[PDB]
A paper describes a structure:
Additionally, the final product is often contaminated with side products due to over oxidation and therefore requires considerable purification efforts. CDHs belongs to the succinate dehydrogenase/fumarate reductase flavoprotein superfamily and use flavin adenine dinucleotide (FAD) as a cofactor to perform the dehydrogenation of cyclic ketones. The SelenoMet WT CDH crystal structure was solved using single wavelength anomalous diffraction (SAD), using the selenium atom as the dispersion centre. The crystal structure of WT CDH is organised into two domains: a catalytic domain (Cd) which is situated at the ‘top’ of the enzyme when viewed in the orientation shown in Fig. 3A and an FAD binding domain (Fd) which is situated at the ‘bottom’.
To investigate substrate binding, a catalytic variant, Y195F, was generated and used to obtain a crystallographic complex with the natural substrate, cyclohexanone. Initial refinement of the amino acid chains and FAD cofactors against the Y195F density map, revealed strong residual electron density in the putative active sites. 2-cyclohexen-1-one was subsequently modelled to produce the Y195F complex structure. The Y195F complex was refined to the higher final resolution of 1.33 Å, compared to WT CDH (1.86 Å). An 11 amino acid stretch at the N terminus, that was disordered in the wild-type form, was found to be structured in the complex form. There is a funnel leading to the active site and three molecules of the product 2-cyclohexen-1-one (abbreviated using the PDB designation A2Q1–3), resulting from oxidation of the substrate cyclohexanone, were found in association with each protein molecule. The active site of the Y195F variant exists as a small chamber formed between the domains and contains four catalytic residues: Tyr195 (substituted by Phe in this study), Tyr376, Tyr570 and Gly574.
Numbering used by the authors:
A (entry chain AAA): 52 to 598
B (entry chain BaB): 64 to 598
Write the structure that this text describes.
């Protein structure tokens, strides 16, 4: 924090002044800046990196917008009481109660969920109308827990950028292009290489600006007449914060590497409530790309291959490999208190030539990659016994990160047994152990497969008894974190007495999500974020101009 | 401007605050202890006051060495299993965790010796208490490290009451002032940003300001009983815990506008609890450190075993929060302990959180029926009572048949002594906390005996809870609370569960909360004594 006396605030103390100062150039920052600019305010976006877009650039930009205009025009109602029941059941399973006045949620979580329902659609419509985020409907994207009877609009809520690829995998690049192009068009200023590091307060404790560290190690002070709106992302890539706050000891994530939790430090001397700090948006990752800091990494949202299993270091299956990524990641952190170890800490995806040829993908974090792609993480052997030798060497390379994990002495025998058992399940279509393929979301993210006339369940096919074979290490990671200072439903960052710190706002992964540890559907990070960017810019516009 | 002034102002009257106050007073300082409750002792009063003191005087005199390199390998291996490396310069720990562990080894014994010498905490050795992971080859002093108050009962279950008696009696004798009904709510700073005192809310809702000339030392306990903080920070959604109910995380609020580093906020000292005593806020509740009964199993709502019921409490609690992402539920959220008349008569205990309790004890949580089919009807009624806390979980339609199968299977393992599913009884800690059992000449494994085919039967709901939390502002090894640049704020100190533990999610041994705490109370008081008098 920097505090200015009245004299200082009214002097030549600032190198620049705007009505609204936005911090970060991902979805939260760009949309907050656009909505602010369209209310007639002067706006600057300050970005720590040399490039715009943050994690959002990397995303597929599915965005889950309840009650949106396309789904209604398509005749698909999204009744508010039933929307609230779906999200309450998924978010707070222990406390969900359809007879309780807030469904078993706290008043804050209920109010935040209502705010997503009320505001995501008008936000989406305005961004599209102005040309900053034109969209198309994604009617076939079903919610991640659509089988729950509380979900009364099981598909229809997803939008994505109009010019996203067919697979949607580059939707984030298209969104950052449209949003940033519109923002520049619209007279929003951008300052890159500006790492915000303090909020400046006046004598009344109101936010009146920021201090940023520039790349020459000089500092600048920039005045906000109305509001400072943080959209600075999460803290996946500050390992100390990640380790000390999250509920699982993840290895990294697909978040931009500049997402280091600066707002946690900035607000440490402002009296905020840090909330939801124990949760991230979770996903499995290609382990070596996380340790190797491959900035192109995606989370493993689609675990590719039908003639493919995951095994643990014993050579046994432990999980439905097609389970929703936010839930599958948690299996990797099961704790064995007797052995003082995480038995699933790394799992090994193993596949055959059929899945290599017909399930490879450049998209959605697949470990199986097509010719010409980066395959440094793919282990290869002509035989299963050779493959285990190579898996062992790979585990040894990372010993100091994974408890000096070793394959069981019985790995080879156990893997052969596991494959024979899996192949029987693949032949009947019924995975009696882990129910792979029996929920619709398992199929949604199944990936590509070779068409087989006899195939009973599209998520499984027997692994060939002839090589070659392929493997990759899978570890647990994030998309990014989703905890931070608590806001009200208009994005105002609160003090410990639940009262706004005047002039201070936050949107997106830098503030607390109301979704706890849950991931409701594809697009469940960005759709709510656009709702709160809209509500925050609307409230920020109403602030008095201050000194 | 201040209504009272002391050299050292201590906040909280459990182990951390009383020992910090005593060590401060014995350096010649004037000292006050401010306590929020209208009684002294906090969670410490409820404890068994085992305290794990590496390299202590009794174990050495008994010929038991505790070599420092091997102590550090044991705690590093247990605390940070992914990163533990015997060839790494700090064993794979961060420099801070390594230095804090070294500080425990260096200072716990002199702290224990001085408290005993002055008469504030006389002790006896507990040589047979083995470390919780003594089978690990890194542990080269597998037993000997535990002390307990001299006059604790044979079972040690009232050691906390004895310790609070000896410590508080000594403190009053020694001229330490006490102010109860004083809820500290702010640190007062001078213009240089140094702590110079506190503000406390008194019971008449008036506020008083008290000056500290040298230091303010927080020993205010954890945040188990602020449900919002508990829910938003811990790695598991626990229902409560045996912490004193005044442990509401006030230091988290107090330091929110001081620029601290909150660390280890994701971890608590964990234990199963008798679930109804947690929901019912029975202040006498203990964590279930000893899961009583040999003719006893835990089953889930399907009527099947899912865990070794004798596993170390800090690890067993975690099984209750296994997540089933396909059904969007916690399958083990409540487990049901079921036992027969033999364990009722021969494994009951008033101590260590046992669900099986002797005649005369509070048995409100004990579900009863003369048959197993009647018992499941009663278990269902009990789960229905708490539906809004446990996801409306219900017993399986097949519960009765499944329970009969589970019992026949368990009884075969009890007959051979070999629990082929969950290895009950195969680690020494399973025996350490096994509890009492009826002597049986032919018993192969002391943790199991076949459950009778004739009633009556008994059950209790088991849920997950804490002892207390162990996250908060980061200190250095001298107890000084740090700013975000790792520099001491300062005059400001903290000790015990109100600041970050260096033990992550681990529970090294019985006494692994209090022994380290006494080390840091000593180090903090020694550093606080060296502060200049200010403001
Ligand atoms: C990794 C990933 C995530 C993802 C996804 C695919 C991948 C590969 N697909 C998604 C999808 O289709 N739908 C969805 O709902 N979520 C999806 N995700 C998650 C999503 O990408 C993120 O949740 C979202 O993009 C986060 O947006 P937000 O605006 O909160 O954050 P950001 O895009 O990371 O941008 C933050 C920016 O702030 C800058 N920053 C950081 N610190 C500072 C300071 N001190 N000063 C100035 N700027 C700062 C960062 O550099 C970054 O640019
Ligand atoms: C529940 C329990 C825990 C326990 C145990 C048995 C039971 C039933 N047995 C143990 C054992 O044998 N060995 C061991 O190592 N640990 C054991 N535990 C855990 C142990 O009890 C605790 O970790 C330890 O006692 C905590 O000590 P600490 O001094 O940190 O905390 P406290 O005893 O809870 O005292 C805190 C006091 O601070 C007061 N307070 C709180 N807020 C304020 C404010 N704002 N102002 C003033 N005072 C405040 C509390 O009221 C309390 O008295």
């Amino acid at each position: 924090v920097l505090t200015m006396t009245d004299a200082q605030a009214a002097s030549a103390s600032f190198s620049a002044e705007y009505d609204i100062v936005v911090v970060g150039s991902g979805c939260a920052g760009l949309t907050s800046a656009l909505f602010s600019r369209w209310h007639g305010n002067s706006v600057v976006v300050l970005e720590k990196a040399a490039a715009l877009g943050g994690t959002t650039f990397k995303s597929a930009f599915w965005y889950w917008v309840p009650n949106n205009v396309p789904m209604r025009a398509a005749g698909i109602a999204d009744p508010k009481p039933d929307f609230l029941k779906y999200v309450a059941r998924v978010t707070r399973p222990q406390f969900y109660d359809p007879e309780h006045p807030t469904l078993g949620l706290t008043q804050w979580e209920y109010d935040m969920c209502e705010a997503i329902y009320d505001s995501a659609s008008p936000a989406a419509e305005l961004l599209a109308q102005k040309g900053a985020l034109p969209y198309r409907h994604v009617p076939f994207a079903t919610d991640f827990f659509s089988e729950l009877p509380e979900d009364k609009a099981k598909s229809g809520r997803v939008l994505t950028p109009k010019d996203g690829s067919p697979s949607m995998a580059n939707g984030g690049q298209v969104a950052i292009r449209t949003l940033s192009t519109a923002a520049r068009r619209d007279g929003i200023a951008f300052k890159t290489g500006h790492r915000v590091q303090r909020v400046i307060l006046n004598s009344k404790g109101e936010a009146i600006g920021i201090e940023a560290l520039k790349d020459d190690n000089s500092v600048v002070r920039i005045r906000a007449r109305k509001a400072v709106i943080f959209g600075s992302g999460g803290f996946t890539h500050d390992p100390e914060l990640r380790s000390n706050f999250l509920n699982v000891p993840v290895y990294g994530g697909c978040a931009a590497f500049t997402n280091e939790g600066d707002l946690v430090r900035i607000t440490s001397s402002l009296g905020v409530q840090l909330r939801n700090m124990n949760h991230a948006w979770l996903c499995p990752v290609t382990f070596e790309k996380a340790i190797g800091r491959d900035g192109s990494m995606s989370g493993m949202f689609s675990v590719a291959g039908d003639s493919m299993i995951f095994v643990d270091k014993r050579g046994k299956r432990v999980v439905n490999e097609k389970l929703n990524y936010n839930e599958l990641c948690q299996k990797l952190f099961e704790w064995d208190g007797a052995k003082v170890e995480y038995p699933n800490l790394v799992l090994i995806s193993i596949w055959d030539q059929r899945s290599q040829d017909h399930s490879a993908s450049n998209d959605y974090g697949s470990a199986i990659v097509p010719p010409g792609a980066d395959d440094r993480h793919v282990i290869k052997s002509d035989t299963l016994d050779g493959l285990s030798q190579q898996i062992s060497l790979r585990l040894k390379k990372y010993a100091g990160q994974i408890g000096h994990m070793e394959l069981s002495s019985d790995f080879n025998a156990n893997l052969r047994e596991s494959i024979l058992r899996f192949n029987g399940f693949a032949s009947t279509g019924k995975d009696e152990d882990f129910h792979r393929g029996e929920r619709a979301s398992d199929v949604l993210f199944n990936g590509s497969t070779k068409k087989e006339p006899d195939q009973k369940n599209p998520t499984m096919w027997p692994i060939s008894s002839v090589g070659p074979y392929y493997a990759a290490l899978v570890g647990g990671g994030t998309l990014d974190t989703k905890g931070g200072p608590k806001t009200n439903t208009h994005g105002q960052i609160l003090d410990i007495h639940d009262k706004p710190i005047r002039g201070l706002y936050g949107v997106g992964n830098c503030v607390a999500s109301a979704s706890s540890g849950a991931y409701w559907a594809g697009g469940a990070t960005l759709g709510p974020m656009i709702a709160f960017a809209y509500r925050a810019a609307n409230a920020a516009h109403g602030e008095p101009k201050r000194t």
